[PDB]
Amino acid sequence: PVSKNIGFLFLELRLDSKQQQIMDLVLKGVNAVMDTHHRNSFEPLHRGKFGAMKPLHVSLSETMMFANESELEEKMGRIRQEIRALECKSVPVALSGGWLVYENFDASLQFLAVGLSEPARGRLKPVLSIVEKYKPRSRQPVGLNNLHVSFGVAQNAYLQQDESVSRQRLDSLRNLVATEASDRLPLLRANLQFRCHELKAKVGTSVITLPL
């Protein structure tokens, strides 16, 4: 369908029981601040209905829109082969710094995130380099400067207002979570760490695994 000839690369982060409980209390605390300030709350991304588990992610490419099935296979195969040829056998994922808020492509959703640590970004640099080499030439770039894990997602209440009003409320939301909702970030950063032994790629409607 719409996803024909679309590819995207990412890391999958499955949380253990302790990490799930930490994210419950961190997000509850953030959302108490959102309530106090009459802001939209963040839906936790690590849980579904009835506490069904959902993995978290690190995006490693933009949405890659290839011109045809042949180019999809040519470029994704080269990506897979070159990632396999890397020396590394696993990459660490750990977080550094404060809350970030990233918008999706139509600004309808605002994701509460933390950036990757300097060593985590450094170990992913050779992966990003491979993606940059093979991705289609064909507006939300993924790069070393913005690698992150998103933990919650809120609706943009200002989606249909003037762009400048929506951007102002986004910047004051970013300031609000940083100034008033950051006290449990040391607990999050100490515990939300992972080691990934494979990448994933969405290709069309299928997901493939790319071993390290």
Residue numbers in the entry: 61 to 198, 202 to 275
Q: What does the study report here?
A:
The responsible exoribonuclease is Usb1, which removes nucleotides from the 3′ end of U6 and, in humans, leaves a 2′,3′ cyclic phosphate that is recognized by the Lsm2–8 complex. Usb1 is a member of the 2H phosphodiesterase superfamily of enzymes, which contain two vicinal active site HxS/T motifs that are essential for catalysis. We examine the structure and function of Usb1 from Kluyveromyces marxianus, which shares 25 and 19% sequence identity to the S. cerevisiae and Homo sapiens orthologs of Usb1, respectively. We find that the origin of CPDase activity is related to a loop structure that is conserved in yeast and forms a distinct penultimate (n – 1) nucleotide binding site.
Subsequent trials were performed with N-terminally truncated Usb1 by removing the first 58 amino acids (residues 59–275) that was designed to mimic the crystallizable S. cerevisiae and human orthologs of Usb1 (5,11,14). The structure of KmUsb1 was determined by single isomorphous replacement with anomalous scattering (SIRAS) methods and a uranyl acetate heavy atom derivative. The asymmetric unit contains three subunits, each of which is essentially identical in structure with an average alpha carbon pairwise r.m.s.d. of 0.63 Å for residues 61–275. Consistent with previously determined Usb1 structures, KmUsb1 retains the canonical 2H fold, with two conserved HxS motifs buried in the central cleft between the transit and terminal lobes in a very narrow channel that is just wide enough to accommodate single stranded, but not double stranded RNA. In addition, two glycerol molecules are bound in the catalytic pocket as high-occupancy ligands (calculated values are between 0.87 and 1.0), where one of the expected catalysts (His211) forms a hydrogen bond to a hydroxyl group of a glycerol molecule. The active site of KmUsb1 is similar to ScUsb1 as both have a 310-helix loop architecture in the n nucleotide binding pocket (residues 207–209 in KmUsb1) which is absent in HsUsb1. In contrast, this loop is much larger in both KmUsb1 and ScUsb1, with an overall positive charge and includes a 310-helix structure. The overall K. marxianus, S. cerevisiae and human Usb1 structures are highly homologous, although KmUsb1 more closely resembles ScUsb1 (the r.m.s.d. values are 3.1 Å for 182 aligned alpha carbon residues between KmUsb1 versus ScUsb1, and 4.1 Å for 159 aligned alpha carbon residues between KmUsb1 versus HsUsb1).
